[PDB]
Symmetry: C2
Subunit: 143 residues, 2 copies
């Protein structure tokens, strides 16, 4: 619902900040200069003003130690829990790499591919549609 | 506003020497923004690609056609399946954003931050009192309803 996972990965000497909406599989990514508290804080603010972000997990807790990140989380009302998508995204970026000049562009193309892919089978919906569905349903129940 | 879940508006506004790229989902009033060094086709195309990756973007309108004449923009639109939209809410959002940025500016180090704070404030602001909705709730509802 409002639970996300945020991590950084490296490709071509660049840092890719990847946010995953755990329940839907929806992805949002950004290529940043380097892993810094400032970038993480900035990213969280963007994510927050877009979707209802209540809790953000990570595989590297130290990512969330800076006072800029704590302040961003505090201001936006985001909490964190102390203690496929990623591997898949790298695969997609590989397939699409020769179709964009800069890694940034390729990353967004790959995010687009991921969020639009339709699971031919049970359900039959994409990650981008599922997140919108989950959030819409939640609003409806709380009205 | 009148129509279509896939219609967006895209323009650039200037502040503190930087450029603010603002996208508005016409039907809900939802905003998405980003600070960039200056207006360039590459920036615009990059933004559209991100936008298109999260929302079902069909057409995008702009008050200055030149924004979309760039070959990079055309390549991005072609790839994402977007087309230009030919022909008061939108007029308000741009100025209201600046108002919100101004009132939260000092509260932040970088302009970037102030902009995202303003976007957060705008999208979460409930309109319509009893029974009302925020732009963020509105967009999700409109998109979800369109299957």
């Amino acid at each position: 619902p409002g639970i996300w996972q945020l991590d950084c990965t490296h490709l071509e000497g660049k840092v890719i900040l990847v946010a995953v909406h755990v329940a839907s599989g929806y992805i949002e990514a950004e290529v940043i200069p380097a892993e810094t508290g400032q970038e993480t804080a900035y990213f969280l603010l963007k994510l927050a003003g877009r979707w209802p972000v209540k809790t953000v997990h990570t595989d590297n807790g130290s990512n969330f130690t800076s006072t800029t990140v704590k302040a961003a989380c505090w201001w936006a009302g985001i909490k964190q829990e102390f203690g496929s998508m990623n591997k898949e995204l790298k695969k997609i970026i590989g397939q699409v790499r020769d179709q964009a000049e800069h890694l940034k562009t390729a990353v967004q193309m790959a995010v687009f591919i991921h969020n639009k892919k339709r699971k031919g089978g049970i359900g039959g919906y994409s990650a981008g549609e599922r997140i919108v569905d989950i959030i819409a349903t939640d609003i409806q129940t709380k009205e």
